[PDB]
Design a binder for this molecule. Structure first.
Ligand SMILES: COc1cccc2[nH]c(C(=O)N[C@@H](CC(C)C)C(=O)N[C@@H](C[C@@H]3CCNC3=O)C(=O)COP(=O)(O)O)cc12
Lengths: 296, 296
């Protein structure tokens, strides 16, 4: 069982480079608009406590340079929406896929196309953590890289990268410029809340282990949603809801293991440990596969 | 630190569907040739003891249905090269990237674009194991899916998927149709030899931990090369050769840690485990990043 990313071709054709002064980062070119982090309009100085409204009002179109490969795109208008800059350009991107902008919830997964200087470098799969950060791999120059899901030819864009927190995790916005998590686009140290484990995803991953012939952690027992949530709190696991249980029904139907029976399995792994044994080749309980991810 | 795949768009534009009789799998359309596994020509029986020369001479060009999306491609010739069938078609692929064919060695990494009926489904990064298998995720119609690296916009095709082994691992060929390892495109009692850890990759990843600000696993010991190998082989680690030591030279000079000093650390890590810690994001010693992967 491998973590898989979506094929990135539809998004690769949308990545451009945006430069404002000496600040450069990635942008998303869809039809005749380029989307990118508003903090591109900042110098290192403004970055400590910028006034974005003021910094933008004194910019004109000629302050933005947009490069799609070896072609300059002429900016003919500019606008801000929340923390995202919108540069209207000369030309419609002829490679624009069918797409929509969506906001995801913690525990959901998506693919990230990591880009540098407007050039796609790699793709990886990740999950939005309960504390709204991303455990990603982003270096300097990665801002404006996007996250996405694909459903039958339609790209659902859900994330644009803005910043790295001191603990090495990552923070960003949706494509309408709304931050995930209690973070602001400023050059300051900001700490994420204590992260927790995505319980419904661990259960999904145990179903995939059963589906793949690993059965040793199964037992005869059941637990209650109430008493599982008690052990959940103790080990910093997200509380399990009746909504989660209904989501795992298709895997409970497919394998004959009721969710609270699987919770009994998970309760014992949390206390007793793995006995040194292994599940899907993992020493830790994996929590970045959703139920949907497993059934596919 | 994430295991990143290469952006897959340049390969997505080459994936097609090949049907001969009742068997369908994936093909790779480059210029005016479609490459696919030769067992596309096998019927239900066939697979136990196929005589590919005799099965192929009975075929006409029109027995091969090739579909690139909704477009049917006209086959105008065919031949067999080792274990891959090469279908000459009417039309050069307009989306053909710069490419080459390479044969890789155990320990090398690459990306796989998993495909079903010629449509890309997911992309993941992996390594050729020392026993010449792949720990992949391949469902029923994934034969003909390919593995690749991308360097300076040139796609190096190194792997084509042919078989699944009873352990759940995968076997295939280079793009000249020669199998990796001792396997055959025949449904016999073949299993992979015992698998081992790629030692030079573990050491690269430890050097990557030092560069990302981790030093907790270092110690004050060194080791001779032979003593290191005598110990590591007791944990099913591949022997470390003088070539592997030379290869880690640049990472040694950068971090200031001599290669045999890192070997002493690895000996201690194998003896002790992690003691509830993680090195990058793993409670496991990771062996699917190369010295080349780490430098970037
Ligand atoms: C006091 O300050 C701090 C203290 C402690 C931790 C801190 N972290 C950040 C931060 O993350 N700052 C944003 C910019 C602000 C305006 C939101 C940033 O730097 N984002 C990067 C990607 C980053 C770079 C490395 N890995 C990434 O993910 C871009 O891509 C654009 O910047 P570049 O033009 O590439 O340098 C500031 C800070």
């Amino acid at each position: 069982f491998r973590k898989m990313a979506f094929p990135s071709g539809k998004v690769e054709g949308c990545m451009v480079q945006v430069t404002c002064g000496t600040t450069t980062l990635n942008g998303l070119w869809l039809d005749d608009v380029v989307y990118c982090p508003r903090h591109v309009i900042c110098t290192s100085e403004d970055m400590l406590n910028p006034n974005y409204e003021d910094l933008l009002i004194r910019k004109s179109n000629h302050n933005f340079l947009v490069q799609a490969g070896n072609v300059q795109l002429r900016v003919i208008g500019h606008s801000m929406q929340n923390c995202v800059l919108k540069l209207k350009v000369d030309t419609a991107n002829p490679k624009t896929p069918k797409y929509k902008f969506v906001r995801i919830q913690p525990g959901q997964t998506f693919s990230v196309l990591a880009c540098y200087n407007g050039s796609p470098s790699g793709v990886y799969q990740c999950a939005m953590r309960p504390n709204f950060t991303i455990k990603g791999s982003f270096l300097n120059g990665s801002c404006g890289s996007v996250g996405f899901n694909i459903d039958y030819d339609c790209v659902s864009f859900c994330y644009m990268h803005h910043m790295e927190l001191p603990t090495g995790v990552h923070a960003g916005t949706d494509l309408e410029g709304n931050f995930y998590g209690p973070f602001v686009d400023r050059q300051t140290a900001q700490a994420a809340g204590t992260d927790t484990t995505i319980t419904v995803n661990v259960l999904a991953w145990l179903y995939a282990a059963v589906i793949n012939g690993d059965r040793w952690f199964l037992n005869r027992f059941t637990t209650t949603l109430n008493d599982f949530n008690l052990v959940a709190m103790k080990y910093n696991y997200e509380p399990l809801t009746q909504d989660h249980v209904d989501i795992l029904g298709p895997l409970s139907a497919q394998t004959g293991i009721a969710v609270l029976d699987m919770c009994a399995s998970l309760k014992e792994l949390l206390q007793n440990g793995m006995n040194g044994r292994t599940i899907l080749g993992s020493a830790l309980l994996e929590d970045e596969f959703t139920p949907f991810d497993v059934v596919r």
